[PDB]
Amino acid sequence: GPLGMLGGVVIA
Amino acid sequence: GPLGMLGGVVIA
Amino acid sequence: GMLGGVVIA
Amino acid sequence: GPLGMLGGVVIA
Amino acid sequence: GPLGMLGGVVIA
Amino acid sequence: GPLGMLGGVVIA
Amino acid sequence: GPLGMLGGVVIA
Amino acid sequence: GPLGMLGGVVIA
Amino acid sequence: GPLGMLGGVVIA
Amino acid sequence: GPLGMLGGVVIA
Amino acid sequence: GMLGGVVIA
Amino acid sequence: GPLGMLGGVVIA
Amino acid sequence: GPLGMLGGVVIA
Amino acid sequence: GPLGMLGGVVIA
Amino acid sequence: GPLGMLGGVVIA
Amino acid sequence: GPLGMLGGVVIA
Amino acid sequence: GPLGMLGGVVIA
Amino acid sequence: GPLGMLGGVVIA
Amino acid sequence: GMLGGVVIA
Amino acid sequence: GPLGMLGGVVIA
Amino acid sequence: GPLGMLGGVVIA
Amino acid sequence: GPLGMLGGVVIA
Amino acid sequence: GMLGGVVIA
Amino acid sequence: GPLGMLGGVVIA
Amino acid sequence: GPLGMLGGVVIA
Amino acid sequence: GPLGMLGGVVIA
Amino acid sequence: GPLGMLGGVVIA
Amino acid sequence: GPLGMLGGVVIA
Amino acid sequence: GPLGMLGGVVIA
Amino acid sequence: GMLGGVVIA
Amino acid sequence: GPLGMLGGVVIA
Amino acid sequence: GPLGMLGGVVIA
Amino acid sequence: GPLGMLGGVVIA
Amino acid sequence: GMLGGVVIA
Structure with missing residues (x-):
């Protein structure tokens, strides 16, 4: 899935 | 205030 | 002195 | 979905 | 004041 | 049937 | 006043 | 049915 | 005033 | 019979 | 005289 | 007989 | 509505 | 939204 | 057989 | 048989 | 309205 | 006999 | 008069 | 998600 | 038969 | 750190 | 040797 | 005799 | 349908 | 699929 | 004898 | 003997 | 329909 | 003396 | 599959 | 007779 | 791992 | 000597 920071x- | 994502x- | 954040990657 | 006032x- | 409908x- | 909104x- | 459906x- | 006055x- | 029949x- | 209105x- | 929706005379 | 789909x- | 077979x- | 048939x- | 949506x- | 209105x- | 025989x- | 319709x- | 599917006067 | 073989x- | 990796x- | 796939x- | 998504020798 | 297939x- | 021998x- | 006679x- | 399909x- | 319609x- | 004698x- | 049939109409 | 002698x- | 290998x- | 036939x- | 589909020697 998406990877956000x-x-x-x-x-x- | 702020509203959104x-x-x-x-x-x- | 306001700082949102720092991202190190 | 919808976002606003x-x-x-x-x-x- | 403002009046809106x-x-x-x-x-x- | 009918679909109204x-x-x-x-x-x- | 108003009248109807x-x-x-x-x-x- | 009828609607009025x-x-x-x-x-x- | 008005007179209707x-x-x-x-x-x- | 007759239909009058x-x-x-x-x-x- | 007479008056109505249907008058038979 | 007949075959229909x-x-x-x-x-x- | 629809009529038939x-x-x-x-x-x- | 989209309407498909x-x-x-x-x-x- | 068939594959998909x-x-x-x-x-x- | 017959079909209609x-x-x-x-x-x- | 319409008249038919x-x-x-x-x-x- | 006769056939009528x-x-x-x-x-x- | 007469009226029907078959009329025999 | 993913769909297949x-x-x-x-x-x- | 078929060989696949x-x-x-x-x-x- | 590093992101490898x-x-x-x-x-x- | 080494094999993988991320290799740090 | 007659032979047939x-x-x-x-x-x- | 078919007719014969x-x-x-x-x-x- | 295939249709053979x-x-x-x-x-x- | 015959051989095949x-x-x-x-x-x- | 005879065959048919x-x-x-x-x-x- | 057809008429035959x-x-x-x-x-x- | 064979007769199939007669039709009168 | 294979067919033969x-x-x-x-x-x- | 015939010889085959x-x-x-x-x-x- | 060789493949030989x-x-x-x-x-x- | 040796005989096969795969011969390793």
Whole structure:
């Protein structure tokens, strides 16, 4: 299947 | 605020 | 000082 | 599927 | 203020 | 039989 | 006010 | 069947 | 005001 | 027998 | 006189 | 005797 | 709706 | 979405 | 025999 | 045998 | 509406 | 004897 | 008069 | 997912 | 009969 | 790290 | 020798 | 005497 | 359907 | 598939 | 004697 | 002796 | 339909 | 004296 | 499969 | 009579 | 692993 | 000596 990589998310 | 999808691979 | 993220691969 | 905002008044 | 009317939405 | 779809109705 | 029939499939 | 309004005076 | 006269309606 | 239909009369 | 949908006279 | 084959019928 | 005969082999 | 109609298929 | 997909709507 | 519609007024 | 007359039908 | 066939008659 | 499939007056 | 026949020798 | 060899398949 | 995909190898 | 999807000698 | 041979007959 | 005589030896 | 017809075979 | 294959449709 | 069909109207 | 007349047949 | 048949119509 | 006769001496 | 010698046969 | 085929040998 | 479909020697 798909291979995804997300470092990080910051919501302010 | 933000609305939607977020990620390395997004399949809608 | 806001940083989203880092990906090392 | 569908992604968005709906309504009589949409203040965004 | 803003005044808006939306009849309807059909998504199929 | 028949296949109908109505979103909505606003009567103001 | 309003008068009549309303719906997705109206069979009068 | 029939759909409407009858009478000597009709104000709509 | 308005003055109307209807002598009847037959719906068969 | 005879099949007659009269909507109506107004006598003013 | 007479009045109606069907008048027989 | 006769040999006949019918796949299908769609009536709408 | 539809009227008649339907089948793989129809003998009438 | 898509609307497709297929009567039938005969495979021999 | 036959191999694959069959239908009114085929999404692959 | 016979196959069809018969009458004084025929509306299909 | 339409007015139609059919005397008779003989099928032998 | 004789063989007769009459579908019908309409008298208006 | 007479009416039918077979009429023999 | 995948759909078919797989092997060293494939005879349909 | 027939001689056939298949090393391997990767479906991902 | 590294991402490698090898289907297969046949050594006859 | 070595054989595989990823080979790191 | 008369000698005769008939293999077969196919009617379709 | 078929009309006749069949046989290895036919005497008629 | 294939459609074949053989009448007859006589071997003496 | 005879040797081989006979038929309306022969596949070898 | 005789073989076949006989009559005023023959439909074979 | 067809109309046919056969007087007579004598087979001796 | 063989007779098949007669048809009168 | 194969069809025939084998042997050191074949008389046919 | 006749003299015949066959070593061998391989069918694959 | 070689693949070899030998029919036959006759030593007279 | 040797005789066969495959001879390894």
